[PDB]
Amino acid sequence: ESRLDRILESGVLRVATTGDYKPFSYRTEEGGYAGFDVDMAQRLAESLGAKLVVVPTSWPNLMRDFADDRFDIAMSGISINLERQRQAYFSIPYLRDGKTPITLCSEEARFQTLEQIDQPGVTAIVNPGGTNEKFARANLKKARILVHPDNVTIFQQIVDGKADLMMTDAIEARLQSRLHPELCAVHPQQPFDFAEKAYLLPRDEAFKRYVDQWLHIAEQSGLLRQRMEHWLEYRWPTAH
Amino acid sequence: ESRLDRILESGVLRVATTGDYKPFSYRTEEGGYAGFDVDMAQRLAESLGAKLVVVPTSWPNLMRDFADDRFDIAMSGISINLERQRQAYFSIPYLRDGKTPITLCSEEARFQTLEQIDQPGVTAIVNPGGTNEKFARANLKKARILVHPDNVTIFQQIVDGKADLMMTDAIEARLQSRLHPELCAVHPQQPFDFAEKAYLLPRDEAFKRYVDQWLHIAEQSGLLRQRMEHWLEYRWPTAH
Amino acid sequence: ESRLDRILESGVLRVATTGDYKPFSYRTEEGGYAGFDVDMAQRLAESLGAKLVVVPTSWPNLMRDFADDRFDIAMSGISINLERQRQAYFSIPYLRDGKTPITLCSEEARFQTLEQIDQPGVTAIVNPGGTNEKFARANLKKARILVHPDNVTIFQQIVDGKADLMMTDAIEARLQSRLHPELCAVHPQQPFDFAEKAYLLPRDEAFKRYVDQWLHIAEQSGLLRQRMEHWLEYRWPTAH
Structure with missing residues (x-):
C-alpha cells in the first residue's frame, strides 16, 4: 500500500493547484488550467498511465485540503518550508529561488x-x-x-x-x-533569503521516490529548464 | 524487518547480474563473473560481512525475477527508468550517460x-x-x-x-x-537522451539508505571513478 | 507514529551529545554544554517548538544508548560510517573531512x-x-x-x-x-581517508526527511558555514 500503487491501479492522479500563480498555475477565464506545474503535472500523470484530475485549492486552504487528503500531490509553485514539513513531504526541489x-x-x-x-x-x-x-x-x-x-x-x-x-x-x-x-x-x-520550489506530497516513501526519480530525470534531461523558460516567455493575459 | 537485517543475520547477499554487459558484468567462459558492478557487488557484501551470491538474470526476466524476490539487489549496468521505478527502488546513480x-x-x-x-x-x-x-x-x-x-x-x-x-x-x-x-x-x-546507471533495489528504505551510504562513500573516496576506469581499460575478450 | 509527531506533541527533543569534542560539543566547567552541534541542536528544537533536552553519551556507549532509545537524535561531530549505518540512520552530511x-x-x-x-x-x-x-x-x-x-x-x-x-x-x-x-x-x-559529519538518527523516514530539510536549508542559507566558523574561532579553554 503506497498510493503509487493506488494511482497505478486507479489510472487517476489528483493534482492540487491554486491557479493564481503565473507561470506555474493560472486558471484560464475559460475555467481550465494552464502553467508549468500543470504541464509538469500532466507529464507525471502520463508516466503513470493516469488521468490528470486537477483539484483547486488556495494558499489559506492548502494544508486543510492536504490533511483532508483532498489530493495526491500539490503542484503550484509551492515553496518548501518547515511549517509544512511538519505534516507533509516534499519532492526534491525543482527551483532555487528566494x-x-x-x-x-x-x-x-x-x-x-x-x-x-x-x-x-x-x-x-x-x-x-x-x-x-x-x-x-x-x-x-x-x-x-x-x-x-x-x-x-x-x-x-x-x-x-x-x-x-x-x-x-x-x-x-x-x-x-x-x-x-x-x-x-x-x-x-x-534574493533576500533562500528557498526552494518543490511539490507537496503525502508521507509516502515509494511515491516520493518515484516522483523524485521522475523529476530528477526531467531536471537532468534539460526538460525541466526547457519547459520552465517556455512558460516564462509564454503570452499570458495580464490579469484575467 | 529491513532485509538489511535479514542480510546481516544471514551473512548472505544475493546479487542479480546478467553477465552480458561489458564492462559492468560479463560471464567468463570459466562460468565465473567479472566486471565493475561485480567488483562493486563484492565490496558491498564485504561491508556487511556477507557472502556474495551471484544470481543470473536477463533483461527480459529482470522484473519477473525482481517480483519473485529472486535476489537482494541488482548490479549489472542497469539504466534508471520509471517503468522500473513503478515496482522497485533504485540506488543513487553511479554513472551519467545516454x-x-x-x-x-x-x-x-x-x-x-x-x-x-x-x-x-x-x-x-x-x-x-x-x-x-x-x-x-x-x-x-x-x-x-x-x-x-x-x-x-x-x-x-x-x-x-x-x-x-x-x-x-x-x-x-x-x-x-x-x-x-x-x-x-x-x-x-x-548522446540522444539522458539516463543514469544505478542499482535496482526492493522497496526497503533502511537498505537503500545503507547502499546509498556505501555507494556515496565509494564515489567520494574516488574508489568509484578509480575502479570504473580499471574495468574500462581492462583487456576483455571480444565476444566469448 | 513518526517520532516527528511524538516530538511535536511532546514539545521535547532529546539530543545526545558527548561533550568531549571541541568544536562540536564541550561540557563547560559552568556545567552547561557548548559547541556547534549544540547550537544547531537548539535551532532544531526551536523549529519544532520543542524544548532542548541534552542527553550525555560517550563514543563507547553511543550505539548502546542508541539502541536503548535513550534519545531522539545524536549531534556531536559524529563521523558517518557503515558500521553505524547497520542500525541507525544518518542525516545528510554537514561537513567533509578525513x-x-x-x-x-x-x-x-x-x-x-x-x-x-x-x-x-x-x-x-x-x-x-x-x-x-x-x-x-x-x-x-x-x-x-x-x-x-x-x-x-x-x-x-x-x-x-x-x-x-x-x-x-x-x-x-x-x-x-x-x-x-x-x-x-x-x-x-x-587527510589519509574520507569521511563526513552528520547527525545520527533512528530509522524514521518522516523525521530524517524533516531534519534533512532543516539542515539543507541551514546549509544553503549560509547559516551552517557561518555558525561553523564562529565555533572554530571561538576562544575555548585548553582542556577543562
Missing part, C-alpha cells in the same frame, strides 16, 4: 535592501496565506503590509500605485515585470 | 541524427527487454529493428554487416569500438 | 605518511570507541596504540610527550594546534 522585490521601475533605487524597505512610510502588498505573507510579517516591523486576496490582480496594484512594492519569488517578479512594463524586478539574481 | 549510436567506422557520417537513422532502408539491431529495445521501438517509426538475443555477440553483427547500427549507452559504444576496431562510437560526448 | 595526524611541531617531518607512522618505535594515542580508535587499530600493525579515555585532555598527552601523535579529524587537529601551540596539524588539507 524572495525579492518588485516595484515601479522609476522607484527601484529606493527598495534595494530590507533596511530601506522596512520604513514607516512604506506599503508592501502581499497575497494571503503563503510564504509571501509569512515572509513580510516576519520581516516588516515598521512598514505597512497590505493583504490583497487576488494574486492575479495584485501586481496591477503597484502599477496603480496602491502600494510601493511586493516581495515575492524572484521568478514571479521576473514575469510580472514582463507583463507590467511599468514594474521592475529587483536584483532577482540576488 | 543512448548513442555505434556503427561501422566507414559508415559513420550516415548515422549522426535520429533523423538520418529513421529511414526505411535502415536496420537497427538491439538486445531484447531493456532500455536499448524500449528506446528503439519508441524512436524508430520507419526503420527495421532487429532483435538479437545475445548481447555479447550483438556487435559482431554490425562488423559482419547483418545490421547498420546499434544505439546503446555511450559507454558501451565506446568500449565495443575498442574491441571491434571496425566499429565506431558516434558522438558519445553528446 | 583523518590526519597531530603531533609536536618539532617532530612534524617524521609523521607525514602512514608508512612513517607505522613503525615499532612509535606511539599513537586515541580516544576509545570511535572512528579514531577504529582507524588506528585498522592501520597500525606495527606501532603501539595508547588508549586515553578523556578526549578533552588527550592532546596534552602529546604536549607532555606521553605519545608521539594522534590521528584524528583534520578539523580537530586544526583546532587543538591553535589551543596547544606546541602541537601541529599534519597536512589537514590532505
